From a paper:
We identify Atlas virus—an intact retrovirus-like EVE in the human hookworm [name], with an envelope protein genetically related to GN-GC glycoproteins from the family Phenuiviridae. GC proteins are class II membrane fusion proteins, with a three-domain β strand architecture also found in alphaviruses, flaviviruses, and Rubella virus but structurally unrelated to class I fusion proteins. Atlas GC has the hallmarks of an active class II membrane fusion protein: a stable trimeric assembly, a putative fusion loop, membrane insertion triggered by low pH with specificity for late endosomal lipid composition, and membrane fusion activity.
A recombinant ectodomain fragment of Atlas GC (polyprotein residues 2330 to 2772) was expressed in Drosophila melanogaster D.mel-2 cells as a secreted protein. (B) Cryo-EM image reconstruction of a soluble ectodomain fragment of Atlas GC at 3.76 Å overall resolution. The structure reveals a three-domain class II membrane fusion protein fold. The structure of the Atlas GC ectodomain fragment is similar to phlebovirus and bandavirus GC structures, specifically the trimeric postfusion GC structures from RVFV, Dabie bandavirus [DABV, formerly SFTS (severe fever with thrombocytopenia syndrome) phlebovirus] and Heartland virus (HRTV). Domain I, a 10-stranded β barrel augmented by a three-stranded sheet, organizes the structure. Domain III has the seven-stranded β-sandwich topology of fibronectin type III (FN3) domains also found in macroglobulin domains, but the hydrophobic core and disulfide bonding pattern of domain III differ from these and other annotated domains from nonviral species. The most notable differences between Atlas virus and phlebovirus GC structures are differences in the disulfide bonding pattern and in the composition of side chains lining the glycerophospholipid (GPL) headgroup binding pocket conserved in arboviral class II fusion proteins. Specifically, the fusion loop is constrained by four disulfide bonds conserved in phleboviruses and bandaviruses, a fifth disulfide specific to Atlas GC (Cys129 to Cys138), a phenylalanine (Phe136) required in phleboviruses and bandaviruses at the apex of the fusion loop for membrane binding and fusion, and two conserved glycines (Gly128 and Gly134) that provide the torsional flexibility necessary for the fusion loop’s tightly folded conformation.
Residue numbers in the entry:
A (entry chain B), B (entry chain A), C (entry chain C): 1 to 439
Write the structure that this text describes.
């Protein structure tokens, strides 16, 4: 098996029954486990029959459930322009009638059927003369201009942050007395002593690393999700998820959704005012950094519409087991180990890890190795046969060549890690898009 | 009483006095408490007189004090416009005199008494001809335009984030030997062994959940406060708290406070240039999400100008008690329980919790129940009589109907929870406001 | 020495060798240390020879390594303008040729050698008449306008956040049996039992405070660094680090770097269109809040291109030591203490702490003092001689005068702390800068 570190102590508990009291001696064992998909073994025994069956714990990690906050709905959108200009003393082009135009004024002046769709209106005044537009008097030309936004795809996008991530620890827990194997599954919570078959498990300690990726906009296209650069309700931060503000789901499907100016910077030409803006299709921002999103210490995955995020190595659960009328003793599994390296793969200085594949053999039950590169420090759990490991280190250069020294409970094993890593680009787009439909 | 989980161990400490040494045996007890406004009982005893008095601990939760960072002062503001236009060869409307106008140039051209108030100037050039404004020569008309900002209410608004929240644990701690009751109050800190009367308390462990709402703009209108979507010093992020940048308190009262363009998008008309902007009155953003602000795991409340934020259920303090020359033993309080449900209330997918009210009886000293709905998992502390509980679950749909199964140390108790939850809208306002005072 | 709080327990471990089993009794000791640059002593002994040598632990704190995410490159930049206007029926000033100008169109119309540098183009149309520009026909004057950006200094700026900060604990660990001193240095990790000479150290607990400054833009000018108000890839948030978006290092040196409009708000004059923008030189934002950046609970320092950040007081490591075939016992060091105060210094309500200097004497081996002001609570480790302490309290007013009561294991010591603190201003600049080079 593996090698954990433990403490054995005495627990004395007095139960209060109806007008009655019954005290109980016990033995209890606090074991400190780095979850790491280990195989943590234990041995039970009473004073009388020293063999009583082996116990096995396999923590699937330390996970955090999300507590959503649906903040911000949006849709694949395409912002378009429109304009219409008149001569003097015609339509609304007189003293102050075009000058008192309202922002949301749906004009009955060649505004197409899409007038209802959200947007903004504006009144400009260009030169008016017999060589400026072609009228007969030299009176300024009023220019009605209308921006709005169409959708593109019949879907909706739910943006949400996630405060108050809640702790949980699920463990595959098996027991082998003489012949059989129960291998139940348990859901431990930070103070709530669960009881699978006959033993009480409690989550006494958590040493999670401070990981501030847990506060960031998870976007959802129904079944699909991703992480994104934050955007906040009411600010219309351009060129990020949600330069369109749709508050309600029904407000999205019916498409009553506000956006802001400062996106499309219009410049006048007196015939076809040119408005250039960003062609925001959020699906891109999603594709920039989607889920699941593994990394060195954490990984953030959805499972039936709930964004769990767990950690493997940087943390160390601290568990407390009580065998009813027994006592527990761990098992230290001494064994050397051999290491088969590989070539690095992926990006350097990225939220993802510089990938690897370190096969390793144990000539014995699976044991743990505290791998130590130049700076970083990871762990692996290599066993008798094969058992590759993808471990996602975090170097920050292009060329990498270092002497990473694994260390199993036997003798350390030096080796070498080489590779050439490429830098990714998050993304970029400046204002180079425009589209107008004049009528 | 309740049921906590404990460890009893031996502590041997040798005190160094002046050229002297005195060692001491002891008994010590580490108990793991989910604060939850419990009533955690304990029983003291020496080898000689096994009754020595009961001890009672009632943790008020795990709280975080704030360490302010006053970043950003602002005021209820209303941005206004003004303009004045001239004919040719008059005032400053000649070769390049209007073209070299400075940004902060307080012009002596019909700029009212409010000229001193912050803002911006601009020089436009509209058509000039005998039908454009009414002058006699066909030379462009220079247009002086001035934006500025007035206050509305004689108050000030302090924006501040809060890094380095500090840990604290206050506990109501009572003792009952034979006749009386001391019920002191203690302030435990993460490593500093306090000593109330004759026993040493130390905060050995904290399992707080990762809660990234603790980094967000707390706004303060003196006695009142609230949480808000972040805004940063120097960016003038429109339509959020502080499109006005006031650095100093005295700089606010005297009102020397900068704001930026990109708020009011002006469009020319040669007589009354129309500038539309947001009517930012921060009191609104405050009313969007004020304090106190309870939720499922945490609540954030101010108490005498200090923003504490504590947690109840998601966490589990780990305490370490030492009775001087005694030993401690907990008490397990077996008792079944009955549950009286209620109807859900509030919002779904919101930082607030889907409210409930679960009365429950214990037929014995107050005990703990590990309530388990479909996904969520809360705890309650129901007792002999009445004792409602508001618990703020976190469902994420409109209709909700599930089989939540409470679980007391006796037998579990199935029941059903139904409700219809409504979605709230954070807020939204596009540029639909404008106000001008031409003279 | 100091006074720590401990637990002594029994550990029984059975090692599995090749087809062999060997069990081992032991003694183990879990000590709870607030790192605080203490001198935590310990005493070893077996049943036979009760003197076996003193042990000394000196934790350098609880530190967090950064796992970079290079997001955003930029450079000291200066944005400039340019323009050129023509008469009618000349160049590209006809029906719709200036009106179909592209955004990134490098025009062969007096666009200087710097045309290649990034920017934006625009076509305006001012009055055209015999008194508007001086042509002979009264046809509008097309105005070609070009914004771009030059660099200033031949350096590059790396912006990066830092998710998944990893835990580490380095400790100076010495031992003194009879004559000599080994004073090794150890690197403890959250679950990985290190072994310096003959004893196993493990990091069983961490009570770090929730500190949300650990998610903020660290900017780097090569050897220099600082903390800054966040900016995100693709949003071009004006007046903060990176209104220029340079994705790649090579893309910066060659200077192919995008920026956005909404910075320089141009206003037409038909000869010299005036464009005013912010003169962003990031070195300023760096100087606003540079590293190292000490505070009350944490400090964030770089050491060979790696941003460590450690904490001193608000936290309490929980360590677990095992002496091979011995047992450990702490030492309590009773001693009164004298305190020499000082005058406060620095800012109030700032991420930095209100500075102090509290000399203090111990008349014995260095001991610990739980200093308690009106609200705050710090700790110091004063010793026989001198030993100043800079402790960085966090008051939030200008005038401060309170009765801070130190408390050593002997009798408390009242004193008084006075001072006058000044408020700092983060920074501010509105649009008051412009520069044009017409040709
Ligand atoms: C492994 O590499 C380390 C470098 O840190 C070196 O100190 C050690 O001697 C090496 N072990 C070998 C070569 O067996
Ligand atoms: C309570 O509901 C659970 C569903 O999770 C079910 O398994 C159990 O049998 C129920 N108990 C009853 C009906 O007594
Ligand atoms: C020290 O000040 C405290 C105020 O909190 C007071 O209660 C105590 O009596 C003082 N001790 C003295 C004056 O010795």
């Amino acid at each position: 098996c593996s090698e954990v570190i433990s403490v054995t102590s005495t627990e004395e508990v007095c139960t209060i029954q109806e007008n009655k009291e019954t005290c109980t001696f016990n033995h209890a064992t606090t074991i400190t486990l780095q979850p790491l998909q280990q195989q943590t073994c234990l041995t039970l025994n009473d004073p009388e029959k020293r063999p009583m069956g082996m116990l096995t714990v396999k923590p699937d990690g330390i996970k955090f459930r999300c507590n959503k906050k649906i903040e911000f709905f949006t849709r694949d959108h395409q912002i378009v322009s429109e304009s219409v200009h008149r001569c003097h003393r015609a339509g609304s082009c007189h003293s102050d009638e075009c000058h008192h135009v309202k922002d949301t004024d749906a004009l009955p002046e060649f505004s197409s059927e899409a007038n209802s769709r959200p947007g903004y209106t504006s009144c400009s005044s260009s030169c008016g003369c017999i060589t400026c537009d072609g009228c007969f008097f030299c009176e300024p030309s009023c220019l009605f201009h209308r921006l709005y936004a169409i959708p593109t795809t019949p879907t909706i996008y739910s943006i949400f942050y996630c405060p108050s991530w809640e702790l949980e620890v699920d463990a595959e827990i098996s027991l082998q007395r003489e012949d059989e194997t129960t291998t139940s599954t348990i859901r431990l919570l930070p103070g709530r002593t669960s009881t699978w078959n006959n033993i009480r498990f409690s989550l006494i300690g958590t040493i999670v690393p401070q990981l501030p990726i847990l506060s960031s906009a998870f976007v959802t296209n129904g079944r699909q999700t991703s992480i994104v650069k934050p955007a906040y309700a009411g600010q219309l931060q351009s060129n990020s998820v949600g330069q369109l503000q749709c508050p309600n789901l029904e407000a999205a499907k019916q498409f009553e959704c506000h956006f802001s100016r400062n996106l499309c910077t219009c410049t006048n030409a007196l015939h076809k005012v040119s408005c250039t803006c960003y062609d925001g299709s959020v699906e891109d921002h999603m594709e920039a950094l989607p889920l699941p999103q593994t990394s060195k210490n954490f990984l953030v995955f959805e499972k039936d519409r709930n964004i769990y995020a767990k950690t493997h190595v940087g943390s160390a659960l601290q568990l407390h087991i009580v065998a009813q009328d027994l006592k527990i003793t761990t098992v230290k599994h001494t064994s050397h180990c051999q290491v088969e390296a590989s070539d690095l793969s992926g990006c350097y200085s990225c939220t993802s890890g510089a990938s690897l594949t370190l096969s390793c053999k144990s000539d014995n039950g699976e044991v743990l190795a505290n791998m130590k590169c130049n700076e970083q420090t990871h762990v692996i759990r290599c066993t008798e046969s094969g058992f590759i490991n993808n471990i996602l280190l975090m170097f920050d250069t292009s060329e990498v060549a270092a002497d990473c020294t694994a260390a199993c409970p036997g003798g350390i094993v030096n080796f070498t890690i080489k590779g050439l890593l490429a830098f990714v680009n998050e993304r970029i787009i400046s204002q180079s898009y425009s589209a107008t439909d004049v009528e």
